[PDB]
Amino acid sequence: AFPKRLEYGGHALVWSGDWSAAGARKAIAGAARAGYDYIEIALLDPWQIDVALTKDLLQEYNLRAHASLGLSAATDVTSTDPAIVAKGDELLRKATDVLYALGGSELCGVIYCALGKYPGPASRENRANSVAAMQRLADYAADKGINIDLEVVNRYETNIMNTGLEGLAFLDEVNRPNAFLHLDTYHMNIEENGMAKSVLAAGDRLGYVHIGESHRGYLGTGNVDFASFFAALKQIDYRGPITFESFSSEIVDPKLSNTLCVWRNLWHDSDDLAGKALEFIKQRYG
Amino acid sequence: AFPKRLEYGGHALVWSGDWSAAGARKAIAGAARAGYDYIEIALLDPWQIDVALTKDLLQEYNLRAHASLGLSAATDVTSTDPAIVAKGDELLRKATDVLYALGGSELCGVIYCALGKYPGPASRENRANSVAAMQRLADYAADKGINIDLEVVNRYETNIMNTGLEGLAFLDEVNRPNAFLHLDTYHMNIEENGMAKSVLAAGDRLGYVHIGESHRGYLGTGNVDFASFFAALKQIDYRGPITFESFSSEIVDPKLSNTLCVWRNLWHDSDDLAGKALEFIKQRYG
Ligand SMILES: O=C(CO)[C@@H](O)[C@H](O)[C@@H](O)CO
Ligand SMILES: O=C(CO)[C@H](O)[C@H](O)[C@@H](O)CO
Ligand SMILES: OC[C@@]1(O)OC[C@H](O)[C@@H](O)[C@H]1O
Ligand SMILES: [Mg+2]
Ligand SMILES: [Mn+2]
Ligand SMILES: [Mn+2]
């Protein structure tokens, strides 16, 4: 395992829908202004990122970076098409290379399949293909001091693992020291039998956390049982990244936002949302 | 507005993935056995149902019927393709005709758009086309003593209305006395600011209710705040259909199950699930 600490982050889409020079600065300035320790960069196309520009911004604002992504149909490592798995392998290596160049240590999110709606259930072969790709990625990342964190997401976003317990079985199949479970309270609110079971089962295997409200808006305005969740994190003495994640039609990443079906305005003022989110989380954990 | 009564129902997919002669008898006998007042028949293809045989089964088991459906891409009444809207109008007329023939009075579900994951947000034209379609359907249904109930569903299943408050603004534009809001606790768990706000706002305009757990399995084994939801129903003295809705990979409807991304086995025993659900609901309402 590469070093993890208790640190608080904001997902780029709280502030910015692109990673242009302007968009990168808007997101990094926004995270720093609210007092976050790190920005989580959305790396859906890691060839698009200006690495030198981004490193200069992280140094300018004294901010750390982690990275998350989802694969697409063209890069789906669950595919029975060996050429598509190979394109997925290539994108994940590029994402790892970008994160390394930014001095980051965490590549998280839906790195194990195409993010979005599958037309049917996953086969044993789809799952086996994903596990092998995550072994190859974990080994590549390990050479660069990077941990990979497999995000459990809801049924509309993957057919591979929708609960923490399914995620832990997948993780154990990957069987690599720098691979961890990533839990997201928004996804857990749909799929889990309460908000404690998966955290208590994970213990030291839990390597990354996303804090999202039931509707992905302001924390404490939805249905998520944060009290039970933070009680469980305390029980396992979780000391890893905690990212505030929120999506509003106010700020659109043309790819990610439509894949995540962000039809509604849940907020308009990024600074107010992000400030209140960090206060909400620190009141309950730290 | 045609008469509504407080009555408890089971969705057909609790028992049968198809509405064959055999599937219909299994589902109707199952709903009767569990002590439900009605079965909710899924009419995604209303030409597929043997109406006379179903009528005989309803009489045989002393059961009532209501109907729900979702449209598909080919029948999407939000489409800017007038030929697709016409196919949707035709499907909804046929569904109304089947419901009338079964002596039912409620056509509910995702009747105002294609059920499933839109690749992008709805245009003003998409919303206008949906409103107009629901006016034409309401007027057709009114001639056969049928109410229509527009089911608010989550972002992954419609881009038109994801909260009760959005549904009520939509119904204001429809402006038909036999058009009602339909709320579903599974969808509310994702999209709503708590489980009361939309119910209190709807009052008499709430015409239909689905009871679904957060993961669509056994009631009480997920995250839905049923205490808050049933309290709100009591506060408006809701007197209309309440249908238990649940999906497991155990019982598959080739189309609907994959649209709803039902990847997991949440149950195997239809009678245990349906009996426990009815007891769960009656202990908390009526
Ligand atoms: O909640 C849902 C879909 O998620 C159901 O109630 C469907 O709308 C209905 O059409 C199934 O028959
Ligand atoms: O919860 C998520 C998706 O629903 C993930 O955090 C998201 O896909 C990230 O990969 C965005 O960078
Ligand atoms: O890998 C796919 C999988 O996790 O999909 C969900 C199922 O519940 C589980 O048994 C697996 O088939
Ligand atoms: Mg007869
Ligand atoms: Mn997340
Ligand atoms: Mn429903």
Coordinates of C-alpha atoms and ligand atoms in Angstrom, one line a residue:
Chain A
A1 CA 0.0 0.0 0.0
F2 CA 1.2 3.6 -0.8
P3 CA 0.8 6.2 1.9
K4 CA -2.9 7.3 2.6
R5 CA -3.8 10.0 5.1
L6 CA -7.2 11.5 6.3
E7 CA -7.6 14.4 3.8
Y8 CA -10.7 16.2 2.3
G9 CA -11.1 16.8 -1.4
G10 CA -13.6 18.3 -3.9
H11 CA -14.5 16.7 -7.2
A12 CA -13.6 19.0 -10.2
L13 CA -17.3 19.1 -11.4
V14 CA -18.3 21.1 -8.2
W15 CA -16.6 24.0 -10.0
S16 CA -15.7 23.2 -13.6
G17 CA -17.0 21.1 -16.6
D18 CA -13.7 21.2 -18.5
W19 CA -9.9 21.1 -17.8
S20 CA -8.8 24.0 -20.1
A21 CA -6.3 26.4 -18.5
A22 CA -9.4 28.4 -17.3
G23 CA -11.3 25.3 -16.2
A24 CA -8.4 23.7 -14.3
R25 CA -7.7 27.0 -12.5
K26 CA -11.4 27.5 -11.6
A27 CA -11.6 24.0 -10.1
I28 CA -8.2 24.3 -8.2
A29 CA -8.9 27.9 -7.0
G30 CA -12.4 26.7 -5.9
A31 CA -11.0 23.8 -3.9
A32 CA -8.3 25.9 -2.2
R33 CA -10.8 28.8 -1.5
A34 CA -13.1 26.3 0.4
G35 CA -10.0 24.9 2.3
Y36 CA -9.9 21.4 0.7
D37 CA -6.6 19.5 0.9
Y38 CA -6.9 18.1 -2.7
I39 CA -8.8 18.4 -6.0
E40 CA -10.1 15.2 -7.6
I41 CA -9.5 15.6 -11.4
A42 CA -12.0 13.7 -13.8
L43 CA -9.5 12.0 -16.2
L44 CA -12.1 10.5 -18.7
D45 CA -9.6 11.5 -21.6
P46 CA -6.1 11.6 -20.0
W47 CA -4.5 12.7 -23.3
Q48 CA -6.5 16.1 -23.0
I49 CA -4.8 17.2 -19.7
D50 CA -2.0 19.8 -19.9
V51 CA 0.3 18.3 -17.2
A52 CA 2.8 21.2 -16.9
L53 CA -0.1 23.8 -16.6
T54 CA -1.9 21.6 -14.0
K55 CA 1.3 21.0 -11.9
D56 CA 1.9 24.9 -11.9
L57 CA -1.7 25.5 -10.7
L58 CA -1.4 22.8 -7.9
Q59 CA 1.9 24.5 -6.7
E60 CA 0.4 28.1 -7.1
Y61 CA -2.6 27.1 -4.8
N62 CA -0.7 24.7 -2.6
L63 CA -3.2 21.9 -3.4
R64 CA -2.7 18.1 -3.9
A65 CA -4.5 16.1 -6.7
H66 CA -6.1 12.7 -7.0
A67 CA -7.7 11.4 -10.2
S68 CA -11.0 9.5 -10.9
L69 CA -12.3 8.2 -14.3
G70 CA -14.9 6.0 -15.9
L71 CA -14.1 3.9 -19.0
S72 CA -16.4 4.0 -22.1
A73 CA -17.6 1.4 -24.6
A74 CA -14.3 2.0 -26.7
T75 CA -12.1 1.2 -23.6
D76 CA -14.3 -1.3 -21.7
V77 CA -11.9 -3.8 -19.9
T78 CA -14.9 -6.2 -19.4
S79 CA -15.3 -6.6 -23.2
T80 CA -15.0 -10.0 -24.9
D81 CA -13.3 -8.0 -27.7
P82 CA -9.5 -8.3 -27.0
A83 CA -8.8 -5.0 -29.0
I84 CA -11.3 -3.1 -26.7
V85 CA -9.7 -4.5 -23.5
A86 CA -6.3 -3.4 -25.0
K87 CA -7.6 0.2 -25.6
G88 CA -8.8 0.2 -21.9
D89 CA -5.4 -1.0 -20.7
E90 CA -3.8 1.9 -22.7
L91 CA -6.1 4.6 -21.3
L92 CA -5.6 3.4 -17.7
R93 CA -1.7 3.5 -18.2
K94 CA -2.0 7.0 -19.6
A95 CA -4.2 8.1 -16.6
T96 CA -1.6 6.5 -14.3
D97 CA 1.2 8.4 -16.1
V98 CA -0.7 11.8 -15.8
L99 CA -1.3 11.2 -12.0
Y100 CA 2.4 10.3 -11.5
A101 CA 3.5 13.5 -13.3
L102 CA 1.2 15.5 -11.0
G103 CA 2.7 13.8 -7.9
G104 CA -0.6 12.1 -7.1
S105 CA -1.0 8.7 -5.3
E106 CA -4.7 7.7 -5.9
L107 CA -6.5 6.6 -9.2
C108 CA -10.1 5.9 -8.2
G109 CA -13.6 5.6 -9.7
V110 CA -15.1 3.3 -12.3
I111 CA -11.7 2.1 -13.7
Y112 CA -12.9 -1.6 -14.1
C113 CA -15.7 -1.2 -16.7
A114 CA -17.6 1.2 -19.0
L115 CA -19.4 3.8 -16.8
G116 CA -23.1 3.6 -17.7
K117 CA -26.0 1.4 -18.7
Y118 CA -25.2 -2.3 -19.8
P119 CA -27.9 -4.0 -21.9
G120 CA -27.8 -7.2 -19.7
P121 CA -26.1 -8.9 -16.7
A122 CA -22.3 -9.4 -16.7
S123 CA -20.9 -12.9 -17.6
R124 CA -18.2 -14.7 -15.6
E125 CA -16.0 -13.9 -18.6
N126 CA -16.8 -10.1 -18.4
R127 CA -15.9 -10.2 -14.6
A128 CA -12.7 -12.3 -15.2
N129 CA -11.6 -9.9 -18.0
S130 CA -12.0 -6.9 -15.6
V131 CA -10.2 -8.6 -12.7
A132 CA -7.2 -9.4 -15.0
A133 CA -7.1 -5.8 -16.3
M134 CA -7.2 -4.5 -12.7
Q135 CA -4.2 -6.8 -11.9
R136 CA -2.3 -5.4 -14.9
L137 CA -3.2 -1.8 -13.9
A138 CA -2.3 -2.3 -10.2
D139 CA 1.1 -3.7 -11.2
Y140 CA 1.7 -0.7 -13.6
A141 CA 0.5 1.8 -10.9
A142 CA 2.7 0.1 -8.2
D143 CA 5.9 1.0 -10.3
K144 CA 4.7 4.7 -9.9
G145 CA 3.7 4.6 -6.2
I146 CA 0.0 4.8 -7.1
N147 CA -2.9 3.0 -5.3
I148 CA -6.0 2.1 -7.4
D149 CA -9.4 2.3 -5.7
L150 CA -12.4 0.4 -7.3
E151 CA -15.6 2.5 -7.0
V152 CA -18.8 0.5 -6.3
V153 CA -21.6 2.3 -8.3
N154 CA -25.3 1.7 -8.8
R155 CA -27.0 -0.7 -11.3
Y156 CA -27.5 2.1 -13.9
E157 CA -23.7 2.8 -14.0
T158 CA -22.2 -0.8 -13.9
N159 CA -23.3 -4.5 -14.0
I160 CA -20.0 -5.7 -12.3
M161 CA -20.4 -4.6 -8.6
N162 CA -23.3 -2.6 -7.0
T163 CA -22.6 -3.4 -3.3
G164 CA -19.5 -3.0 -1.0
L165 CA -19.7 -6.8 -0.4
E166 CA -19.6 -7.6 -4.1
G167 CA -16.7 -5.0 -4.5
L168 CA -14.7 -6.7 -1.7
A169 CA -15.1 -10.2 -3.5
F170 CA -13.9 -8.5 -6.8
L171 CA -11.0 -6.8 -4.9
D172 CA -9.9 -10.1 -3.3
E173 CA -9.9 -11.7 -6.8
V174 CA -7.6 -8.8 -8.0
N175 CA -5.3 -9.8 -5.1
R176 CA -2.8 -6.8 -5.3
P177 CA -1.4 -4.9 -2.3
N178 CA -2.1 -1.4 -3.8
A179 CA -5.7 -2.2 -4.8
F180 CA -8.6 -0.9 -2.5
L181 CA -12.4 -0.6 -2.3
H182 CA -13.9 2.9 -3.0
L183 CA -17.4 3.5 -1.5
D184 CA -19.7 6.4 -2.5
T185 CA -22.7 7.3 -0.2
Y186 CA -24.8 8.3 -3.3
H187 CA -24.5 4.8 -4.8
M188 CA -24.7 3.1 -1.3
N189 CA -28.1 4.9 -0.7
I190 CA -29.6 2.9 -3.7
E191 CA -27.9 -0.5 -3.4
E192 CA -26.8 -1.2 0.3
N193 CA -28.7 -2.8 3.2
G194 CA -28.0 0.3 5.4
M195 CA -24.9 2.4 5.4
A196 CA -22.6 0.5 7.9
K197 CA -22.4 -3.2 6.7
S198 CA -20.0 -2.6 3.7
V199 CA -17.7 -0.2 5.7
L200 CA -17.4 -2.7 8.7
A201 CA -16.7 -5.6 6.2
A202 CA -14.1 -3.6 4.3
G203 CA -12.0 -2.4 7.3
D204 CA -8.4 -1.8 6.0
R205 CA -9.6 -2.7 2.4
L206 CA -11.5 0.7 2.3
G207 CA -9.0 3.0 0.5
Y208 CA -11.3 5.9 -0.8
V209 CA -14.6 7.5 0.0
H210 CA -17.0 9.8 -1.9
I211 CA -19.6 11.8 0.1
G212 CA -22.6 12.5 -2.1
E213 CA -26.2 13.3 -1.1
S214 CA -29.1 11.0 -2.4
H215 CA -29.7 13.5 -5.3
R216 CA -26.0 14.5 -5.7
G217 CA -26.8 18.1 -4.4
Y218 CA -26.3 19.9 -1.0
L219 CA -25.3 17.6 1.8
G220 CA -28.1 17.1 4.4
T221 CA -31.0 18.1 2.0
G222 CA -31.6 14.5 0.9
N223 CA -32.1 10.9 2.2
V224 CA -28.6 9.6 2.9
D225 CA -28.0 8.3 6.5
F226 CA -24.6 10.1 7.1
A227 CA -24.8 9.5 10.9
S228 CA -24.6 5.6 10.3
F229 CA -22.0 6.0 7.6
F230 CA -19.6 8.2 9.7
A231 CA -20.2 6.0 12.8
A232 CA -19.0 3.0 10.7
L233 CA -15.9 4.9 9.4
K234 CA -15.1 5.7 13.0
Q235 CA -15.4 2.0 14.0
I236 CA -12.8 1.0 11.4
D237 CA -10.7 4.2 12.1
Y238 CA -10.7 5.1 8.4
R239 CA -7.8 7.4 7.5
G240 CA -7.9 7.9 3.7
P241 CA -9.2 10.5 1.1
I242 CA -12.8 11.8 1.5
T243 CA -14.1 13.7 -1.6
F244 CA -17.2 15.8 -1.7
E245 CA -19.0 14.8 -5.0
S246 CA -21.9 16.9 -6.4
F247 CA -23.5 17.3 -9.9
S248 CA -25.8 20.1 -11.1
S249 CA -26.9 21.1 -14.7
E250 CA -25.3 24.5 -13.6
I251 CA -21.8 23.0 -14.5
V252 CA -21.7 20.5 -17.5
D253 CA -18.9 18.1 -18.7
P254 CA -20.6 17.2 -22.0
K255 CA -19.5 13.5 -21.6
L256 CA -19.6 12.7 -17.8
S257 CA -22.7 14.9 -17.0
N258 CA -25.0 13.1 -19.6
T259 CA -23.6 9.6 -18.7
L260 CA -24.6 10.5 -15.1
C261 CA -28.0 11.8 -16.3
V262 CA -27.6 15.2 -14.5
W263 CA -30.8 16.8 -15.8
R264 CA -31.5 19.0 -12.8
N265 CA -30.1 22.2 -11.2
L266 CA -29.4 21.1 -7.5
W267 CA -27.2 24.3 -7.0
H268 CA -25.9 27.4 -8.7
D269 CA -23.2 28.8 -6.3
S270 CA -20.1 26.4 -6.3
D271 CA -18.4 28.2 -3.4
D272 CA -21.5 28.1 -1.1
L273 CA -22.1 24.3 -2.0
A274 CA -18.4 23.4 -1.5
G275 CA -17.9 25.5 1.7
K276 CA -21.1 24.0 3.4
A277 CA -20.1 20.4 2.2
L278 CA -16.6 20.6 3.8
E279 CA -18.1 22.0 7.1
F280 CA -20.8 19.2 7.0
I281 CA -18.2 16.5 6.6
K282 CA -15.7 17.9 9.2
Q283 CA -18.6 18.3 11.8
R284 CA -19.2 14.5 11.5
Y285 CA -15.6 13.1 10.8
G286 CA -12.1 14.3 11.8
Chain B
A1 CA -61.7 12.4 -12.0
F2 CA -63.1 8.9 -11.7
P3 CA -63.5 7.3 -8.2
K4 CA -60.3 6.1 -6.3
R5 CA -60.4 3.9 -3.3
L6 CA -57.6 2.9 -0.8
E7 CA -56.6 -0.6 -2.1
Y8 CA -53.4 -2.7 -2.1
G9 CA -51.9 -4.3 -5.1
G10 CA -48.9 -6.4 -6.3
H11 CA -46.9 -5.7 -9.5
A12 CA -47.1 -8.7 -12.0
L13 CA -43.2 -9.0 -12.0
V14 CA -43.4 -10.2 -8.3
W15 CA -44.7 -13.5 -9.8
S16 CA -44.3 -13.6 -13.6
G17 CA -41.9 -12.2 -16.3
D18 CA -44.5 -12.8 -19.1
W19 CA -48.3 -12.5 -19.4
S20 CA -48.9 -15.9 -21.1
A21 CA -52.0 -17.9 -20.1
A22 CA -49.8 -19.6 -17.5
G23 CA -48.0 -16.4 -16.3
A24 CA -51.3 -14.6 -15.8
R25 CA -52.8 -17.5 -13.7
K26 CA -49.6 -17.8 -11.6
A27 CA -49.5 -14.0 -11.0
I28 CA -53.3 -13.6 -10.3
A29 CA -53.4 -16.8 -8.0
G30 CA -50.3 -15.4 -6.3
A31 CA -51.7 -11.9 -5.7
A32 CA -55.0 -13.4 -4.5
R33 CA -53.1 -15.9 -2.2
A34 CA -51.1 -13.1 -0.5
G35 CA -54.4 -11.1 0.1
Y36 CA -53.9 -8.2 -2.4
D37 CA -57.0 -6.3 -3.7
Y38 CA -55.6 -6.0 -7.3
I39 CA -52.8 -7.0 -9.6
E40 CA -50.9 -4.3 -11.6
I41 CA -50.4 -5.7 -15.1
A42 CA -47.3 -4.5 -17.0
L43 CA -48.6 -3.5 -20.5
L44 CA -45.4 -2.7 -22.3
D45 CA -46.9 -4.6 -25.3
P46 CA -50.7 -4.3 -24.9
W47 CA -51.3 -6.4 -28.1
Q48 CA -49.7 -9.4 -26.4
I49 CA -52.3 -9.9 -23.7
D50 CA -55.2 -12.4 -24.0
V51 CA -57.8 -10.0 -22.5
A52 CA -60.8 -12.5 -22.3
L53 CA -58.6 -15.1 -20.6
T54 CA -57.2 -12.5 -18.1
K55 CA -60.8 -11.3 -17.4
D56 CA -61.9 -14.9 -16.6
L57 CA -58.9 -15.3 -14.2
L58 CA -59.7 -12.0 -12.4
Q59 CA -63.3 -13.3 -11.8
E60 CA -62.0 -16.8 -10.8
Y61 CA -59.7 -15.4 -8.1
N62 CA -62.0 -12.3 -7.2
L63 CA -59.1 -9.9 -8.0
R64 CA -59.2 -6.4 -9.6
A65 CA -56.6 -5.1 -12.1
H66 CA -54.9 -1.8 -12.8
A67 CA -52.2 -1.4 -15.6
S68 CA -48.8 0.3 -15.8
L69 CA -46.4 0.6 -18.7
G70 CA -43.3 2.4 -20.0
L71 CA -43.0 3.5 -23.7
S72 CA -39.8 2.6 -25.7
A73 CA -37.7 4.6 -28.3
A74 CA -40.2 3.4 -31.0
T75 CA -43.2 4.9 -29.1
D76 CA -41.7 7.9 -27.3
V77 CA -44.4 10.7 -27.2
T78 CA -41.6 13.3 -26.4
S79 CA -40.0 12.6 -29.8
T80 CA -39.7 15.5 -32.4
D81 CA -40.5 12.7 -34.9
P82 CA -44.3 12.9 -35.4
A83 CA -44.4 9.3 -36.7
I84 CA -42.9 8.1 -33.3
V85 CA -45.4 10.3 -31.3
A86 CA -48.3 8.7 -33.4
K87 CA -47.0 5.2 -32.5
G88 CA -46.9 6.2 -28.8
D89 CA -50.5 7.6 -29.0
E90 CA -51.6 4.3 -30.6
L91 CA -49.9 2.2 -27.9
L92 CA -51.5 4.3 -25.1
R93 CA -55.0 4.0 -26.7
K94 CA -54.6 0.2 -26.9
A95 CA -53.4 0.1 -23.2
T96 CA -56.5 2.2 -22.3
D97 CA -58.7 -0.2 -24.3
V98 CA -57.2 -3.3 -22.5
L99 CA -57.6 -1.6 -19.1
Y100 CA -61.3 -0.7 -19.8
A101 CA -61.9 -4.4 -21.0
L102 CA -60.5 -5.7 -17.6
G103 CA -62.8 -3.3 -15.7
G104 CA -59.7 -1.3 -14.4
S105 CA -59.8 2.5 -13.8
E106 CA -56.0 3.4 -13.4
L107 CA -53.4 3.6 -16.2
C108 CA -50.1 4.5 -14.5
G109 CA -46.3 4.4 -14.9
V110 CA -43.9 6.1 -17.4
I111 CA -46.7 6.8 -19.9
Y112 CA -45.3 10.3 -20.9
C113 CA -41.9 9.2 -22.3
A114 CA -39.6 6.3 -23.2
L115 CA -38.7 4.4 -20.0
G116 CA -34.9 4.2 -19.8
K117 CA -31.6 6.1 -20.0
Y118 CA -31.8 9.2 -22.2
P119 CA -28.3 10.2 -23.6
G120 CA -29.0 13.9 -23.0
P121 CA -31.4 16.4 -21.5
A122 CA -35.0 17.1 -22.7
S123 CA -35.6 20.1 -25.0
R124 CA -38.5 22.5 -24.6
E125 CA -40.1 20.6 -27.6
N126 CA -39.6 17.2 -25.9
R127 CA -41.5 18.5 -22.8
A128 CA -44.2 20.3 -24.9
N129 CA -44.8 17.1 -27.0
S130 CA -45.2 15.0 -23.7
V131 CA -47.7 17.6 -22.2
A132 CA -49.8 17.5 -25.5
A133 CA -49.6 13.6 -25.6
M134 CA -50.9 13.4 -22.0
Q135 CA -53.8 15.8 -22.9
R136 CA -54.8 13.6 -25.8
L137 CA -54.5 10.4 -23.6
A138 CA -56.4 12.0 -20.7
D139 CA -59.3 12.9 -23.1
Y140 CA -59.3 9.3 -24.6
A141 CA -59.2 7.7 -21.1
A142 CA -62.0 10.1 -19.9
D143 CA -64.4 8.5 -22.4
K144 CA -63.8 5.1 -20.7
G145 CA -63.9 6.2 -17.0
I146 CA -60.1 5.9 -16.6
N147 CA -57.7 8.1 -14.7
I148 CA -54.0 8.4 -15.9
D149 CA -51.3 8.6 -13.2
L150 CA -47.8 9.9 -14.4
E151 CA -45.1 8.1 -12.5
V152 CA -42.1 10.3 -11.4
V153 CA -39.0 8.2 -11.9
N154 CA -35.3 8.7 -11.3
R155 CA -32.8 10.4 -13.7
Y156 CA -31.7 7.1 -15.2
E157 CA -35.3 6.2 -16.3
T158 CA -36.6 9.7 -17.6
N159 CA -35.2 13.1 -18.4
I160 CA -38.8 14.8 -18.2
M161 CA -39.6 14.8 -14.5
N162 CA -37.6 13.3 -11.6
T163 CA -39.4 14.9 -8.6
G164 CA -43.0 15.2 -7.5
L165 CA -42.7 19.0 -7.6
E166 CA -41.6 18.8 -11.3
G167 CA -44.5 16.4 -12.0
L168 CA -47.0 18.8 -10.4
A169 CA -45.7 21.7 -12.7
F170 CA -46.1 19.3 -15.7
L171 CA -49.6 18.4 -14.6
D172 CA -50.5 22.1 -14.4
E173 CA -49.7 22.4 -18.2
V174 CA -51.6 19.2 -18.9
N175 CA -54.6 20.7 -17.0
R176 CA -56.8 17.5 -17.1
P177 CA -59.1 16.5 -14.2
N178 CA -58.3 12.7 -14.7
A179 CA -54.5 13.2 -14.8
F180 CA -52.7 12.6 -11.5
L181 CA -49.2 12.3 -10.1
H182 CA -47.8 8.8 -9.3
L183 CA -45.0 8.6 -6.7
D184 CA -42.7 5.6 -6.2
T185 CA -40.7 5.3 -2.9
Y186 CA -37.7 3.7 -4.8
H187 CA -37.4 6.7 -7.2
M188 CA -38.2 9.3 -4.3
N189 CA -35.3 7.7 -2.3
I190 CA -32.9 8.9 -5.1
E191 CA -34.4 12.3 -6.2
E192 CA -36.5 13.9 -3.4
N193 CA -35.6 16.3 -0.6
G194 CA -37.0 13.8 2.0
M195 CA -40.1 11.6 1.6
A196 CA -42.8 14.2 2.6
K197 CA -42.3 17.4 0.5
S198 CA -43.8 16.1 -2.8
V199 CA -46.7 14.2 -1.1
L200 CA -47.8 17.3 0.9
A201 CA -47.5 19.5 -2.3
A202 CA -49.5 17.0 -4.4
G203 CA -52.4 16.5 -1.9
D204 CA -55.5 15.5 -4.0
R205 CA -53.3 15.4 -7.2
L206 CA -51.5 12.2 -5.9
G207 CA -53.5 9.5 -7.6
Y208 CA -51.2 6.4 -7.4
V209 CA -48.4 5.0 -5.1
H210 CA -45.6 2.4 -5.6
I211 CA -43.9 1.0 -2.5
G212 CA -40.4 -0.1 -3.4
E213 CA -37.3 -0.6 -1.2
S214 CA -34.1 1.4 -2.1
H215 CA -32.7 -1.8 -3.9
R216 CA -36.2 -2.9 -5.1
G217 CA -36.0 -6.1 -2.8
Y218 CA -37.7 -7.0 0.6
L219 CA -39.3 -4.0 2.3
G220 CA -37.4 -2.9 5.4
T221 CA -34.0 -4.3 4.3
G222 CA -32.9 -1.1 2.5
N223 CA -32.6 2.7 3.1
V224 CA -36.1 4.0 2.3
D225 CA -37.6 6.2 5.1
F226 CA -41.0 4.5 5.0
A227 CA -41.9 6.1 8.4
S228 CA -41.6 9.6 6.8
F229 CA -43.5 8.5 3.6
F230 CA -46.5 6.9 5.3
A231 CA -46.7 9.8 7.8
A232 CA -47.0 12.2 4.7
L233 CA -49.7 10.0 3.1
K234 CA -51.7 10.2 6.4
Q235 CA -51.3 14.0 6.5
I236 CA -53.1 14.2 3.0
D237 CA -55.4 11.3 3.9
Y238 CA -54.3 9.5 0.7
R239 CA -57.1 7.1 -0.6
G240 CA -55.9 5.5 -3.8
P241 CA -54.0 2.4 -5.1
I242 CA -50.8 1.4 -3.3
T243 CA -48.8 -1.3 -5.3
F244 CA -45.9 -3.3 -3.9
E245 CA -43.2 -3.3 -6.6
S246 CA -40.0 -5.5 -6.5
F247 CA -37.6 -6.9 -9.1
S248 CA -35.1 -9.8 -8.8
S249 CA -33.1 -11.7 -11.5
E250 CA -35.3 -14.6 -10.2
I251 CA -38.2 -13.4 -12.5
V252 CA -37.1 -11.7 -15.8
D253 CA -39.2 -9.8 -18.3
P254 CA -36.9 -9.8 -21.3
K255 CA -37.4 -6.1 -22.0
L256 CA -38.4 -4.4 -18.7
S257 CA -35.8 -6.2 -16.5
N258 CA -32.8 -5.1 -18.6
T259 CA -34.2 -1.5 -18.9
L260 CA -34.4 -1.4 -15.1
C261 CA -30.8 -2.9 -14.8
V262 CA -32.0 -5.8 -12.4
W263 CA -28.6 -7.5 -12.2
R264 CA -29.0 -9.1 -8.7
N265 CA -31.1 -11.8 -7.1
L266 CA -32.8 -9.9 -4.1
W267 CA -35.3 -12.8 -3.6
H268 CA -36.4 -16.2 -5.0
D269 CA -39.7 -16.9 -3.1
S270 CA -42.5 -14.6 -4.7
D271 CA -45.1 -15.7 -2.0
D272 CA -42.8 -14.9 1.0
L273 CA -41.8 -11.5 -0.6
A274 CA -45.4 -10.5 -1.5
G275 CA -46.9 -11.7 1.9
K276 CA -44.2 -9.9 4.0
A277 CA -44.6 -6.7 1.8
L278 CA -48.4 -6.5 2.3
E279 CA -48.0 -7.0 6.1
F280 CA -45.2 -4.3 6.1
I281 CA -47.5 -1.8 4.3
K282 CA -50.7 -2.5 6.3
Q283 CA -48.8 -2.2 9.6
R284 CA -47.8 1.4 8.5
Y285 CA -50.9 2.6 6.6
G286 CA -54.7 2.2 6.7
Ligands
LIG1 O1 -41.1 2.2 -11.2 C1 -41.2 1.6 -12.3 C2 -40.0 1.7 -13.2 O2 -38.8 1.9 -12.5 C3 -42.4 0.9 -12.7 O3 -43.5 1.3 -12.0 C4 -42.7 1.1 -14.2 O4 -42.9 2.5 -14.5 C5 -43.9 0.3 -14.7 O5 -44.1 0.7 -16.1 C6 -43.7 -1.2 -14.7 O6 -44.9 -1.8 -15.1
LIG2 O1 -19.7 8.3 -8.5 C1 -19.2 8.4 -9.7 C2 -20.0 8.2 -10.9 O2 -21.4 8.1 -10.6 C3 -17.7 8.6 -9.9 O3 -17.1 9.2 -8.8 C4 -17.4 9.3 -11.1 O4 -17.8 8.5 -12.3 C5 -15.9 9.8 -11.3 O5 -15.3 8.8 -12.1 C6 -15.8 11.1 -12.0 O6 -14.5 11.5 -12.1
LIG3 O1 -19.7 -9.9 -11.7 C1 -21.1 -9.7 -11.9 C2 -21.9 -9.8 -10.6 O2 -21.3 -9.1 -9.5 O3 -23.2 -9.2 -10.9 C3 -24.1 -9.1 -9.8 C4 -24.4 -10.5 -9.2 O4 -25.2 -10.4 -8.0 C5 -23.1 -11.3 -8.9 O5 -23.4 -12.6 -8.6 C6 -22.2 -11.2 -10.1 O6 -22.7 -12.0 -11.2
MG4 MG -65.0 -14.3 -19.8
MN5 MN -18.3 8.8 -6.8
MN6 MN -42.8 2.1 -9.9

